Symmetry: C2
Amino acid sequence: LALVGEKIDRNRFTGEKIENSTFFNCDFSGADLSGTEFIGCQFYDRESQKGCNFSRAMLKDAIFKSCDLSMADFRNSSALGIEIRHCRAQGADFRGASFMNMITTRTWFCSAYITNTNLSYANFSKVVLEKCELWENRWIGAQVLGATFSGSDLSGGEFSTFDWRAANFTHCDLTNSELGDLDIRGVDLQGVKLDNYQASLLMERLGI
Amino acid sequence: GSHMALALVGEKIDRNRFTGEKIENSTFFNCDFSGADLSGTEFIGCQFYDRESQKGCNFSRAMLKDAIFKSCDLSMADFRNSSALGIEIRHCRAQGADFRGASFMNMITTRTWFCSAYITNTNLSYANFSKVVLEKCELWENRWIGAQVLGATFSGSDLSGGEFSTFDWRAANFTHCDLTNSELGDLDIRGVDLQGVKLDNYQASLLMERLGI
């Protein structure tokens, strides 16, 4: 399977399963991708330098494994309990995307599974991702201002060019990660889990 | 020249009554040594505090270059404004002693200044070190509980094996200090400058836990 330049109809792939396909410059905006599963699929065209629009797509329980989602516009999604794995999503736009259930609780709760995924330069400004599976990702350069990952599990993460001040990390698990310029003086770390190797390393940053 | 088993009380010591001598197992209660010259004078197992008077001896402005106190009871001695370069206080008790103004510095054989003091194994509970310059000195194995240190600097010194329970860590300058093997109290790395100081495994673990890790 290999579409190009098409705008995808609301119910074209709903619930379906697709493998080793390619969608270049397609426009899944507004689509209904509940229960859809993409495997080995590519959504980013290099000769073209453009990716796919997923803005406002319904993605409740959607699934992405080993896909290339670079430059994916996930703005304003509905992505409750979705899972992303071994994917490339460098530069992808996540602002607006809701990973939270607002119905079966009288407040809110989150659900989301994004691992083994390259999130470099992804935009998570203001995103809510409390208590989710966010382990083993590359976060280099990702915008995270206003976000909150409180209680999530980010263990095994790369954070080389990453502003630890901009988002709420209280209660996350950061064991076994590349922490970059994390400075325990100016960054609430209440409840967070560290590995001894890092622990020492962080003292070193303080002159000790 | 030496003295043994003295018991002085309420006397005012003369400049040279003891200069450079060796004194043992003696008590002096409520004696003003103010201004005396105790250069090189050695005191062993002496007592300068009396539990019945609740009084100490005045050492203010005493000249104490190279002086030795060993195994003495200096509870609330007044050393204010003294000259104690190269002094030495080992295994002494010195609760409430007042060191404010006492220079531990050499300002002759240098362009500027340097320090020299050996105070170790000493109980310094509620001692007063406001503004004291104590750079690069042996200060190991003391009890510091309650000590006033506002404006002092211990920079470079070796405080290893110490006891700092009720101790205000933002008060003085502890850069480059050796603080290993010590009970560290309420020390919090977020609030205080620890550039160059040395901590051990155990200690370091405990300072993380404080933050919440």
